[model samples]
Target: ELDELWKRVKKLVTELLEQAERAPEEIFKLLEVAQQLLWLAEMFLRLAAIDPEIQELAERVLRLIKRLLEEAERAGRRIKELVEVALALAKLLEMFYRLKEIQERATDPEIQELAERVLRLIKKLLKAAEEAGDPRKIYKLVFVALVLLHLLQTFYRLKEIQEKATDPEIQRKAQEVLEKIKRLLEAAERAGDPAKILLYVIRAQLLAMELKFAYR
Candidate 1:
């Protein structure tokens, strides 16, 4: 039953990605659907732990499942919900954030549609990487996007978290990264050479540690 539920969530992600690709404006729909996706995950994890169905699963499977769901709450059986929110923010960041520039440059309908199709894979890819403890997929998935300097514009999602973040420090750190990326953007624009940009690229790569540890 849990396996079936998991597949259903993935199917929903796949569907939303396809729909949003056809119309960039529909990317907002991705955010809306992400809420549902997270709820599904939260509902399954939080409830099934205390609920009956989970007991029938193998001990090893249950242990691994508990490890994954452990951080979903704050010292309790209830769900975190914010993790789901964070996942959505990450998805929105990839799909629709800085979409104006993309719309401007890729005015050709065929090309614009092609770009969205590819972007829909990014969120799915990222979430998998986060859960599976694998960074290789992330490197492979965004290689072109990162080298092209397409989505290096902003971070923190202040408005998203202003109402209910546990601590401002995460947002504060995000602000600092935003400034760094902006400066890097200025330099990249002036130089306009991938050779020179590779240096900044390495710097950006180092930020993975910051995100992994700080965000955790």
Candidate 2:
């Protein structure tokens, strides 16, 4: 049942990308994609209640979907804005694939520990955002943290496979992804109140460094 829903979502996203290329001015297509994502997020939330393993990832996906919905609503008649929303939707679909891959693989205790630590830090960041009383800021932070978490998960997956295959290309690609993640964290740090966001960035950077060092 979950697999069927995912396949449908993937097809809609592909259609969304094609629409972006052919008729970027069409707001209705964007709205349709957003609505599908909204439904998928709702399914994830409902399933999460019965499955503890999916709870964390589901909550993050829900937040990102809500943010995307907001962006789509305010995107107006600007073709550029619509195109950007399409790209963001594509990125979210890629993350969902990575998440599914992770679920199919066996869980590593060490990686689980790191994931929990990052989640705790993200919770702190969300708390700070709430105290500041800005819904937009909270959504923005959630998007940043969600991407960071996925990057770490990807890094862990690469390391696991690289152990058996000894692939130099995989190592190089992993390094590149790590560098991009660090750059993202730096951008996040500078985007908001330094005291609140920067603290989380610093801790996140440390966690990223720890993951990098673990593979060495």
Candidate 3:
């Protein structure tokens, strides 16, 4: 099943990669690729039915990007300068045309979890968008792309996450990580803060699961 799924076709990746499309089918193929990327992008973001550590990782990525951008700026180099400025000019232009194909091709359960997670986040995001910024909804404006990019770097920190393989060696290496998680959870409970507790629990749970723990 894995081999069959991974068997390469004359992929339209080139078309998507180079914007070299003219045929109707080619366009469709490109769209499908785009959606797969979005779905991937979604996973990197904390938009799954997983823990908050995903977001924390994502946050780390965001911070890294900011630092990179700052570093670039300091060196007087433009870091995708126009993209940032014209962000609002083109919105929701996500690879929606191929969303169906991407979802169909997805083998990872995290995507399924992501769909549910997105449903939850979207419910709130929609409401937040509606009231968008009486100082209350300002945070909602932070888009999924930002969230995804945030997690991109976070996702890179660990190994074998895609397989969710928490090999024995990996577990042994992450002992300090496990202890920190224990403390984080206890601290939240001890502090009598459900919200804070939930945040830490979510983070730890997601990370442990990604690490392939038996009972994360």
Which candidate comes out best when scored by lDDT? Answer: 2
Task: State every prediction's TM-score relative to the real structure.
Answer: 0.30, 0.40, 0.29
Candidate 3 residue-wise lDDT, 1-216, digit = tens: 111111111122232446525445656654565444334334323222223423343343333333332333343203233123112111221221123234455555544444344334433443443343232222223243323222322322332243454566654655545455545544544542334434655676576555545435
Report the error of model 1 at residue 173, Å. 1.4
Instruction: Provide the overall lDDT of each model, using Cα atoms, as 2-decimal numbers.
Output: 0.43, 0.51, 0.37
All candidates: CA RMSD (Å) = 19.3, 9.5, 15.9
> What are the per-model numbers of colliding residue pairs?
0, 0, 6
**lDDT tens readout by residue for model 1, 1-216:** 545545545655565567667765457756565556656556556544331222322232333333433433222202223234333333333334345344555434433443444334333343443454322333333343344324332222322332245778775665565456546544644553334555664565456346546554
lDDT of 2 by residue, 10-70 (tens): 5555656666666644657666655655455455444543435445544554444444444
In candidate 1, what residue range of length 10 has the lowest lDDT sum?
73-82
Q: Candidate 2: deviation at residue 59, Å?
A: 6.0
**Model 3 lowest lDDT segment of ten:** 1-10
- Indicate which candidate wins on TM-score: 2
Clashing pairs in 1: none
The TM-score-based order of candidates, best leading, equals 2, 1, 3
